[PDB]
UniProtKB/Swiss-Prot annotation:
Record's catalysed reaction(s): an acyl-CoA + a 1,2-diacyl-sn-glycerol = a triacyl-sn-glycerol + CoA; 2 alpha,alpha'-trehalose 6-mycolate = alpha,alpha'-trehalose 6,6'-bismycolate + alpha,alpha-trehalose
Function comment: The antigen 85 proteins (FbpA, FbpB, FbpC) are responsible for the high affinity of mycobacteria to fibronectin, a large adhesive glycoprotein, which facilitates the attachment of M.tuberculosis to murine alveolar macrophages (AMs). They also help to maintain the integrity of the cell wall by catalyzing the transfer of mycolic acids to cell wall arabinogalactan and through the synthesis of alpha,alpha-trehalose dimycolate (TDM, cord factor).
Lineage: Bacteria, Bacillati, Actinomycetota, Actinomycetes, Mycobacteriales
Organism, as annotated: Mycobacterium tuberculosis (strain CDC 1551 / Oshkosh)
Subcellular localization(s) per the UniProt record: Secreted
Protein name per the record: Diacylglycerol acyltransferase/mycolyltransferase Ag85C
Length: 277
């Protein structure tokens, strides 16, 4: 496979962002990582045949590397907890710096792309489409947490972020009273997704493993927990006039890679027709 490892400078973050890339078309699928994003390889390349599955698909595949517990958003400040010496500015990187770099050097279009996220980034992909519709007319959320500002979610997200690398949710979106919590809440931003007529692909398993694996307590628990939010998202979406979505809620699936890969393959034809055909 013709996969490349690029060093894309982030002026806003003051460092270079490693990006795994496979060409094949002017339009691309941005594959966002999960909560435990690593600094060597994006989770999709480590756990799935993503690049192979999209080889010769008429689409380019972009895999940013890094961003553990970042939620791919622009933080208010450095994480006050683990000595992070810079401020995450992933929204700026994904909507300005990276696309500019890829257009100049590779010819990848800055508009008409797809943002695909899972777990931590499932909602992130949706928010990106919400505020950058020209760049993301398509967005997929796989097992995402779609109502981050509601009830216990801010607290659960805070513990998860601290548990994964010691990141501070308050450094990111500030106090739960801060506008950022609602600004980045997919549920709250549904009207934008409808108004922009975003093509959305929302998936979430039910907690029961199939032959695909992912059979462990944590993975089963997470999927069953977030499914409640995903169903409320589908309802509110339809109630708000949403008419361009695909909601896959099968009676199987845990919070793990085999299932996310299965969805990535399932949505390929969908992305091809929306972005190209």
């Amino acid at each position: 496979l013709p996969v490349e490892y690029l060093q894309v400078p982030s002026a806003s973050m003051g460092r270079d962002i490693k990006v795994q890339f496979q060409g094949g078309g002017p339009h691309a699928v941005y594959l966002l990582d999960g909560l435990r994003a690593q600094d060597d390889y994006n989770g999709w390349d480590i756990n799935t045949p993503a690049f192979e599955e999209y080889y010769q698909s008429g689409l380019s595949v972009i895999m940013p590397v890094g961003g553990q517990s970042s939620f791919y958003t622009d933080w208010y400040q450095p994480s006050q907890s683990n000595g992070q010496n810079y401020t995450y500015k992933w929204e700026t990187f994904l909507t300005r710096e990276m696309p500019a770099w890829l257009q100049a050097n590779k010819g990848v279009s800055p508009t008409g792309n797809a943002a695909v996220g899972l777990s931590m980034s499932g909602g992130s992909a949706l928010i990106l489409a919400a505020y950058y519709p020209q760049q993301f007319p398509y967005a997929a959320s796989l097992s995402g947490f779609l109502n981050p500002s509601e009830g216990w979610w801010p607290t659960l997200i805070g513990l998860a972020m601290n548990d994964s690398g010691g990141y501070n949710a308050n450094s990111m979106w500030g106090p739960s009273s801060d506008p950022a919590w609602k600004r980045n809440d997919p549920m709250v931003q549904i009207p934008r997704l409808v108004a922009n007529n975003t093509r959305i692909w929302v998936y979430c398993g039910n907690g029961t493993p199939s032959d695909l694996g992912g059979d462990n307590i944590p993975a089963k628990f997470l999927e069953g927990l977030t499914l409640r939010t995903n169903q409320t998202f589908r309802d509110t979406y339809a109630a708000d006039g949403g008419r361009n979505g695909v909601f896959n809620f099968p009676p199987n699936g845990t919070h793990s890679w085999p299932y996310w890969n299965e969805q990535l393959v399932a949505m390929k034809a969908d992305i091809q027709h929306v972005l190209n055909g």
